[PDB]
Design a protein around this ligand. Structure first.
Ligand SMILES: */C1=C\C(=O)NCC/C=C/[C@H](NC(=O)[C@@H](NC(=O)N[C@H](C(=O)O)C(C)C)C(C)C)C(=O)N[C@H]1C(C)C
Lengths: 242, 204, 250, 244, 212, 198, 241, 233
């Protein structure tokens, strides 16, 4: 066939590129950062009415000041989360302080390229790249509220807002215009909830979509249906208002 | 201290006319404390008998090991192992643990099914084979047993006579050893049949 | 470096065949004829010494090998494969038997060991099966005399008489006629020489033929005296001279 | 490097099938037929010797019936070499169980182990599977007489009557036709020989082409007995049953 | 060192001294012998400072991971076993720690586990650990009842450490108190023995021995 | 040491185990249950080194339970004890051996008979009418050697223990804080909650 | 030694070996699970390609991981064994370390991880298995039902089915199961399950096994009759129309 | 042709080429331009940072390896992290064991040999990143150009990345001038910004778009970003 770490004639790693494709098929996920906190939203996407929608976990906590959303082959993210949590807790044990959001991200990204059938650099044991992207969101005293996009490539970027998944290209286009440096947490919630509605095949309700945020005061929380549903409503009204 | 002196017990084998005998006491104590008077130290695989004195845990372990090995041996060879061969197997098995041996004093007795010749052998804890034509002694009362045998024994005894002789050697030796006794058992082995008897002895 | 060939080189084809084994067998067919005959008091194994150059000294090369003092082997197929097989066979008879029980292994069991070695080269990673078939002939106290055939697959079977290699089909037929359960060793040796003749093109003498037997014990071949139960090896390779003397009454 | 020559023996087909397991089975289908019939008072194993000859020694021969335990035995269909490798690990497994618990190994426990070993060569290792199918015939005090079957895949199942190797479809049909729950060992013995006799690719079902074994509870004792028939014993039973 | 923890009608009381000794030398009188694993979990220290302090901190980390993993607070029983099993891994290597793992969970209620480097793990209502244990037991055993006002129990605990600090040469400095309810643990101050002794003496009339 | 007693009567096995847990100068607990149920009809009592004691018991427990689930069957008492001996026998030659002694009391639902197994840290196994680990033996072995019958009832048996426990409270140097008794029989395992005055 | 990357990405972002693993599942006999208000039931069909087996000893389809949790599956049998073993082992381990049996969700998460792991490790192929795991968490009466697949993905269901013709029986269940009101009775819950299987088993009371799990390690498998009876009372329901 | 010899790095093409290395080499050309130049007193790095959206950040291009050494990357960001981390260890090792600052010439030899290992052994892949290393050691100021093929070269100045040929010509022209900008960092940096601008096209260099680093005589290697580089735009 061809090595799992072969370069294309264009200078790209085939497996990583293909990895990116599987992610495009993933369920939408959006992250918006405001000086009041960061909001993470995701499309549940139950493949059947019998599937208890709340057993769909695509937004998890890394630490009290760091949470993250995923898109793509979600089973692949379990070990990434484990590593991330372990890194976070560990930094605290060794330094008696919280892990910086960016470092936490950098750590996760370092596992990224650890694949191959025998790459001359260490002992990269993992037969293929991960098939999932992550939106890591949190806050730390050094750089306040932050939002990171981490990919199977090992690279990561910082965004004011970012959408990954099936409707990304379109939703990102919206975010490009919608986002402004003075957004409020409230505004960001509706904005996320709105864009999710536009890209979702399903009629966005409080069962096929989930919200969550991270604030210096209360840390990472995942909005419970009742809370999100009322935000849904609050949105319909404002829209139907003009 | 001496592992071979924790539990106590003795075994002794003898050759007679077209027969072999092997006996043992039934004691299993912990130092001075007598614990069991039902600890037989004689086992057999097919027509080959094996007595084992020493540390109880190893006595048990070795029996379970030789059963395992003799069973596979039969499945592959398609015949039961003979005394001579088994002696070799016992010897190599022990020497394999040369620098961390089992604390046992193995004794083999049996009749070569193909030659009908009586056979007995003793081994030190690392396999040194002692193949005697008259008798083999083992256990915490081995000195006494040597004394008994060297005097009482005489060639080609008939089964009924060999039984008296081996039983008297065992009995009187055990009575001079604080760690042996509490009942004995004796096996008289002939080509055709094998008889097992429990002796009546002091219980102190 | 490091052998990265940790996968099987012999696999199942859609038809259920194991190619490499089939091919190995083919290599055996192309090999020089060799045969075995079991009598009531001995076994004989022989083959033709196909010297590959008039300058080569055929004595310096034996196709008939002693494995234990009562077991010998002969083959058909790849000479070098056979050679290393013989070394392994002699060693396994020790490490896996004599060193445990203090006595040489009985024929069926040693054969069983050799067979395994071949089976493994059929499934292990990075290797090809052995390109040979063997004929083991030996004797043990509880099984008497025996003759075995071991194939590249690792399969083996007991024989009253058989042949492998080039003219096996023909040789086998000639043996099925002449064999009976009353043959004495000398008779088998004779049948042997006759059977081999057909399969031999040109020269046929004690220098182009190689034959050994498993028969009575040879105290004279022991090398020492003083131990009653040690009566001598049953395996004996006939000499060029012994072979010719027989060919005269052929 | 090596990748170029890697057959990749452990992968799924687009249909979700294991190529090698399938092909291994394909190989087994050409092996001498083996039949296992379980009765109320015993079990029966019968197998047809593939490839025979005037010169083939039969008293010394064994190629399909192997004793694993004192209460367990198997009938082989496929690569003998491969089978032996497994058979020996099986004999060891039984002895270990015995050493650990001082009790003879329960039949299914032995079968699951062997099946597991096979299953492994199916999921990892890059090696080929064993081209073997076993019919297990054994007895224990928890399920009495049992008859099992395992193949290259690593799956096993229980049976009242079963065949493996060549012409199984034919053989299975015939057994499905005359097998009855209340059968007796000798009944089973006959049904076995008859089935083979009907599926045989040979002219006649002679003894020199058979291997036979029975696990019967010799009434005059109270214990179970394993018996692999000798050439003559098969020759006899072959006459009585009416095949002469 | 003297540490005690006991269950009563109002939850759990935990009291410790604060003296560290290197032989007969008094290294410190201000050591925190209570590790706050979390809002509902406390650990006491006895034996080697480094050993306890280090491994109990490590325990906190292990508990936190459990909660992130399982989305739920770890049980007192489980927290104590993490420590118990870890410590058992090092059995014979020289670790020295007499520890108490105390907490309150809805499912277990008030719970106290004693864990030492021996590999010993025990659940109980009362436990006194350290060189001053016997002294604390003397006072505690003969004044303990299941019905003690959260305020009386608090004092009994404090008084028991006081007894130990007095008699034991290795115990002293100050007393650190804690109360554990299902709502979590509540810190009830640091009481220096320097002032506490005289106060208690005068007010209670005890220690009548000492010359005042 | 701790008191570990076992006596096999007619249709059951009774295990008595001291409740005290002492560390040096202080008795830390008086209600300690030195036992683990390996299977519904198999109970194991233990005594020995501080850590190894429970670590070993729970380890054995886990395995016997795993075997039960996998086979949907309960191994005979004999089999369970053989497994335990093998484990201790391995331990004795390991880097750091388990310093644990145990009594295994079980009811063989098949043979329909009670069984008592004594096994020390060396892997020494013996089956007895009654047994004990530690010093207890030195007192009880002759008490039972005297007042013991094969056909005794569970009730008679419990009285025989009462006899033993009394002698132990009279002559033993330590205060083992009484024992916890348990009965294993055709119906399983139960505790005699009223022995502190039975 | 052998570490070839057997599960890898293809141009369209697919991992064929994992997908082909699912195909193996689709070909497996049907399995279904429905949770009532106080119990969960698991049903499985028995192939008939060959019939002359010994049902006493032939390994059944519903396996106990612990006393309060069971697991059924669709796909390769040999594969399922390895997963069931690992699970049973983890079960005992969890009891030993946390001094508490596993929750159904935990056990499920474990198994799912093992499956996921085999999709990105060299030298191995994914499990040609998909599972249904159900039971009651220790000291909890809320029935639990989860499903896992080769990819390593899992989630809970009110009712679900896997294996051949699962598409069909799922339909039946989607228009026969009301979350609003779950089968309040063990009996009515076991009926719904048999009904759903009858859509695909095509009359086979001997080809349909059931297992009822109740709170507090109360697990029991019904007999042919007990089952055969539900088959009967159900076939009449039809005729009576 | 090529298609039969580019499946790995353990294969030579009929003409003696190593395609996998060449493809890796391509990843660099596709990367954002970066420049390096040095006088006798200082060495300077100037890099154009690239972003994804306008809602994203600009990926860092300069990494510090020690107080006297640092580099700029073009290509696979991860690989640059790997290699720069390796360079940090080597610098660190030289200090801890010998109490010696790792010479730039030596650092270069190390990188070369580390890279080479992933071009002759099956399983490994070449690194997909180019590096420009500057440092001040016992022989003064230095500038190195590192290629994934393992070829490391010492130059007065150079550039790598898309449209890099622009700046490289400029420097190759300015040479005699900037190599003498001793004792005046701000001038060398300006010469550096003028060099890099010769590779612009899309836009012009802004504040959160430009990145500059410098090391010299009494100047510990330091990076400038944002407003810090404003005074040069
Ligand atoms: C509780 C008192 C005790 O329970 N036991 C007396 C032993 C005291 C231990 C501890 N003090 C120390 O551990 C001192 N450090 C120390 O001894 N280090 C060792 C060394 O030899 O240097 C190392 C571990 C080999 C120091 C930290 C004061 C102490 O005061 N124990 C108290 C309480 C738990 C602090």
């Amino acid at each position: 066939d061809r090595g799992v770490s072969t370069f294309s004639p264009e200078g790209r790693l085939f497996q990583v590129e293909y990895s990116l494709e599987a992610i495009k098929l993933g369920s939408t996920a959006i992250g918006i950062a405001t000086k009041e906190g960061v909001v993470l939203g995701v499309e549940k996407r139950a493949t059947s009415p019998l599937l208890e929608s709340d057993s769909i976990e695509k937004i998890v906590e890394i630490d009290r000041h760091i949470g993250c959303a995923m898109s793509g082959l979600t089973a692949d993210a379990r070990s990434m989360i484990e590593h991330a949590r372990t890194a976070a807790v560990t930094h605290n044990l060794y330094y008696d302080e919280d892990i910086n959001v960016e470092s936490l991200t950098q750590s996760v990204c370092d596992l990224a390229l650890r694949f191959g059938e025998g790459a001359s650099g260490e002992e990269r044991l993992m037969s293929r790249p991960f098939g999932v992207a992550l939106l890591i969101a949190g806050h730390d005293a050094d750089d306040g509220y932050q939002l990171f996009h981490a990919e199977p490539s090992g690279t990561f970027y910082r965004y004011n807002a970012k959408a990954i998944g099936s409707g990304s290209e379109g939703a990102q286009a919206e975010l490009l215009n919608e986002w402004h440096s003075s957004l409020t947490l409230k505004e960001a919630e509706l904005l996320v909830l709105k864009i999710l509605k536009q890209v979702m095949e399903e009629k966005l309700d409080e069962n096929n979509a989930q919200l969550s945020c991270i604030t210096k005061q209360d840390g990472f929380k995942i909005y419970d249906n009742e809370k999100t549903a009322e935000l849904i409503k609050e949105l319909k009204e404002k829209e139907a208002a003009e | 201290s001496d592992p071979s002196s924790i539990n106590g017990g003795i075994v002794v084998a003898m050759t007679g006319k077209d027969c072999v005998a092997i006996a043992c006491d039934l004691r299993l104590g912990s130092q001075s404390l007598g614990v069991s008077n039902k600890f037989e130290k004689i086992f057999h695989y097919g027509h080959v008998f094996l007595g084992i004195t020493g540390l109880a845990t190893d006595v048990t372990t070795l029996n379970e090991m030789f059963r395992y090995k003799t069973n596979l041996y039969k499945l592959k060879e398609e015949r039961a192992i003979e005394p001579e061969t088994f002696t070799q197997l016992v010897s190599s098995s022990l020497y394999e643990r040369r620098f961390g041996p089992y604390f046992v004093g193995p004794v083999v007795a049996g009749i070569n099914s193909k030659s009908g010749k009586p056979f007995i052998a003793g081994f030190d804890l690392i396999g040194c084979i002692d193949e005697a034509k008259d008798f083999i002694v083992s256990g915490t009362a081995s000195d006494q047993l040597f004394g008994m045998c060297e005097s009482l024994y005489e060639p080609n005894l008939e089964p009924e006579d060999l039984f008296e002789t081996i039983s008297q050697a065992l009995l009187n030796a055990a009575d001079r050893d604080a760690l042996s006794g509490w009942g004995a058992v004796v096996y008289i082995i002939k080509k055709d049949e094998v008889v097992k008897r429990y002796l009546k002895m002091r219980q102190d | 470096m490091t052998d990265r060939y940790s996968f099987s080189l012999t696999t199942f084809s859609p038809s259920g065949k194991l190619g490499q084994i089939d091919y190995a067998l083919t290599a055996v067919k192309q090999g020089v004829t060799s045969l075995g005959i079991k009598a009531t008091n001995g076994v004989v194994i022989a083959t033709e010494k196909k010297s590959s150059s008039p300058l080569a000294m055929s004595e310096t090369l034996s196709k008939v090998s002693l494995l234990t003092p009562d077991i010998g082997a002969v083959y058909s197929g790849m000479g070098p494969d056979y050679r290393v097989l013989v070394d392994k066979s002699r060693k396994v008879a020790h490490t896996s038997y004599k060193r445990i029980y203090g006595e040489y292994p009985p024929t069926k069991l040693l054969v069983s060991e050799v067979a395994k070695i071949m089976q493994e080269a059929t499934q292990s990673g990075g290797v090809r099966p052995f390109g040979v078939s063997l004929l083991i002939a030996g004797h043990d106290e509880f099984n008497g005399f025996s003759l075995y055939q071991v194939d590249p697959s690792g399969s083996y079977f007991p024989w009253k008489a058989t042949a492998i290699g080039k003219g096996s089909v023909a040789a086998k037929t000639f043996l099925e006629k002449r064999w009976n359960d009353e043959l004495e060793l000398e008779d088998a040796i004779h049948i042997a020489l006759l059977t081999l003749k057909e399969s031999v093109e040109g020269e046929f003498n004690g220098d182009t033929i190689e034959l050994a037997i498993i028969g009575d014990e040879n105290p004279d071949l022991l090398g020492y005296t003083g131990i009653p139960t040690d009566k001598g090896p049953r395996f004996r390779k006939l000499t060029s001279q012994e072979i010719n003397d027989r060919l005269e009454a052929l | 490097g090596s990748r170029r020559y890697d057959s990749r023996t452990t992968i799924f087909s687009p249909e979700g099938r294991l190529y090698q397991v399938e092909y291994a089975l394909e190989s087994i289908s050409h092996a001498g037929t083996a039949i296992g019939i379980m009765a109320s008072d015993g079990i029966v194993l019968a197998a047809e010797r593939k490839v025979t000859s005037t010169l083939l020694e039969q008293d010394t021969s064994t190629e399909k019936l192997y004793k694993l335990n004192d209460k367990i035995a198997v009938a082989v269909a496929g690569l003998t070499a491969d089978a032996e490798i497994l058979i020996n690990t099986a004999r060891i497994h039984a002895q270990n169980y015995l050493k650990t618990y001082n009790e003879d190994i329960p039949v299914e426990i032995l079968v699951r182990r062997l099946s597991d070993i096979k299953q492994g060569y199916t999921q990892h290792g890059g090696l080929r599977p064993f081209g073997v199918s076993f019919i297990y015939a054994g007895y224990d005090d928890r399920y009495g007489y049992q008859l099992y079957t395992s193949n290259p895949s690593g799956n096993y199942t229980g049976w009242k009557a079963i065949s493996v190797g060549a012409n199984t479809s034919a053989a299975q049909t015939l057994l499905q036709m005359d097998y009855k729950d209340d059968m007796k060992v000798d009944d089973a013995i006959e049904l076995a020989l008859k089935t083979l006799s009907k599926t045989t690719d040979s002219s006649a079902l002679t003894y020199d082409r058979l291997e036979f074994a029975t696990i019967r509870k010799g009434a005059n004792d109270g214990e179970v007995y394993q018996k692999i028939f000798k050439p003559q014993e098969i020759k006899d039973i072959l006459v009585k049953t009416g095949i002469t | 060192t003297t540490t005690l923890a006991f269950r009563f009608q109002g939850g759990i009381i935990v009291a410790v001294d604060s003296r560290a000794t290197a032989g007969n030398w008094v290294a410190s009188q201000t050591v925190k012998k209570v590790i706050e694993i979390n809002p509902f979990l406390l650990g006491t220290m006895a034996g080697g400072a480094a050993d306890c302090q280090f491994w109990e901190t490590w325990l906190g980390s292990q508990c936190r991971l459990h909660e992130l993993r399982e989305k739920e607070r770890i049980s007192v029983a489980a927290a104590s076993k993490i420590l118990s099993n870890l410590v058992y891994q090092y059995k014979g290597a020289g670790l020295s720690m007499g520890t108490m793992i105390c907490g309150y969970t809805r499912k277990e209620g008030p719970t106290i586990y004693y864990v030492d480097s021996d590999g010993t793990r025990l659940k109980g209502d009362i436990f006194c650990v350290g060189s001053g244990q016997t002294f604390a037991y003397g006072v505690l055993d003969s004044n303990y009842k299941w019905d003690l006002s959260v305020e009386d129990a608090l004092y009994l605990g404090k008084r028991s450490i006081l007894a130990a600090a007095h008699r034991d040469a290795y115990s002293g400095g100050s007393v650190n108190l804690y109360h554990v309810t299902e709502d979590g643990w509540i810190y009830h101050g640091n009481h220096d023995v320097g002032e506490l002794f005289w106060k208690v003496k005068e007010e209670e009339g005890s220690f009548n021995n000492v010359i005042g | 040491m701790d008191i570990i007693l076992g006596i096999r009567v007619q249709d059951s096995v009774i295990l008595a185990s001291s409740k005290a847990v002492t560390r040096g100068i202080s008795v830390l607990k008086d209600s300690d249950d030195k036992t683990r149920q390996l299977s519904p009809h198999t109970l194991m009592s233990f005594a020995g080194e501080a850590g190894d004691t429970v670590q070993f018991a729970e380890y054995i427990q886990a395995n016997i339970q795993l075997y039960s689930i996998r086979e949907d069957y309960e191994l005979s008492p004999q089999a369970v004890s053989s497994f335990v001996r093998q484990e201790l026998a391995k331990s004795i030659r390991s880097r750091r051996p388990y310093q644990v002694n145990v009594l295994i009391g079980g009811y063989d639902k098949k043979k329909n008979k009670p069984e008592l197994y004594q096994i020390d840290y060396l892997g020494t196994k013996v089956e007895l009418p009654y047994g004990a680990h530690g010093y207890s033996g030195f007192y009880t072995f002759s008490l039972l050697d005297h007042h013991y019958r094969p056909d005794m009832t569970t009730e008679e048996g419990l009285d025989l223990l009462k006899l033993c426990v009394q002698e132990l409270e009279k002559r033993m140097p330590m205060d083992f804080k009484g024992v916890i008794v348990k009965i294993v029989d055709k119906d399983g395992i139960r505790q005699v909650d009223d022995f502190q005055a039975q | 030694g052998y570490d070839r990357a057997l599960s890898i990405f293809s141009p369209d972002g697919h991992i064929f070996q994992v997908e082909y693993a699912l195909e193996a599942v689709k070909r497996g006999t049907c399995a279904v699970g429905v949770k009532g208000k106080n119990c969960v039931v698991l049903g499985c069909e028995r192939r008939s390609t060959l019939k002359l087996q010994d049902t006493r000893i032939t390994p059944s389809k519903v396996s106990k991981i612990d006393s309060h949790v069971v697991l059924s599956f669709s796909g390769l049998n040999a594969d399922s064994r390895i997963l069931i073993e690992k699970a049973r082992v983890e079960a005992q381990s969890h009891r030993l370390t946390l001094e508490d049996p596993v929750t159904v969700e935990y056990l499920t998460r474990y198994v799912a991880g093992v499956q996921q792991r085999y999709t990105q490790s060299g030298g191995v192929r994914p499990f040609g298995v998909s599972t249904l795991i159900a039971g009651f968490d220790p000291r909890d009466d809320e029935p639990k039902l989860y499903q896992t697949e080769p990819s390593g993905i899992y989630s809970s269901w009110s009712a679900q089915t896997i294996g051949r013709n699962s598409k069909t029986v799922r339909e039946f269940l989607e228009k026969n199961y009301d979350r609003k009101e779950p089968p309040a009775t063990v009996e009515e819950c076991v009926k719904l399950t048999v009904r759903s299987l009858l859509e695909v088993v095509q009359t086979g009371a001997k080809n349909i096994e059931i297992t009822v799990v109740k709170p507090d390690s109360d697990i029991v498998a019904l007999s042919s009759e007990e089952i055969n009876q539900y088959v009967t009372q159900i076939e009449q329901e039809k005729q009576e129309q | 042709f090529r298609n039969n010899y580019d499946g790995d790095t353990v294969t030579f093409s009929p003409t003696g080429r190593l395609f996998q290395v060449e493809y890796a080499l391509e990843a660099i050309k596709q990367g954002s331009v970066t420049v390096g130049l040095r006088s006798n007193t200082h060495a300077v790095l100037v890099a154009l940072k690239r972003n994804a959206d306008e809602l994203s950040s600009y990926q860092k291009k300069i990494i510090k390896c020690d107080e006297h050494m640092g580099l700029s990357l073009a290509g696979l960001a991860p690989d640059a992290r790997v290699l720069s981390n390796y360079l940090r260890q080597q610098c660190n090792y030289s200090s801890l064991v010998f109490n010696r600052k790792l010479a730039v010439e030596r650092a270069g030899h190390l990188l070369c040999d580390k890279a080479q290992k992933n071009t002759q052994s099956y399983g490994g892949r070449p690194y997909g990143v180019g590096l420009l290393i500057i440092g001040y050691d016992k022989s003064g100021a230095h500038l190195l150009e590192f290629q994934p093929s393992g070829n490391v070269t010492e130059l007065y100045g150079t550039a790598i990345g898309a449209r890099s040929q622009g700046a490289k010509t400029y420097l190759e022209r300015t040479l005699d001038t900037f190599i003498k900008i001793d004792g005046n960092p701000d001038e060398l940096i300006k010469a550096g910004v003028e060099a890099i601008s010769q590779s612009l096209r899309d836009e012009s260099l802004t504040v959160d778009n430009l990145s500059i680093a410098i090391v010299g005589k009494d100047t510990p290697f330091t990076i400038y970003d944002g407003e810090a580089v404003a005074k040069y735009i």
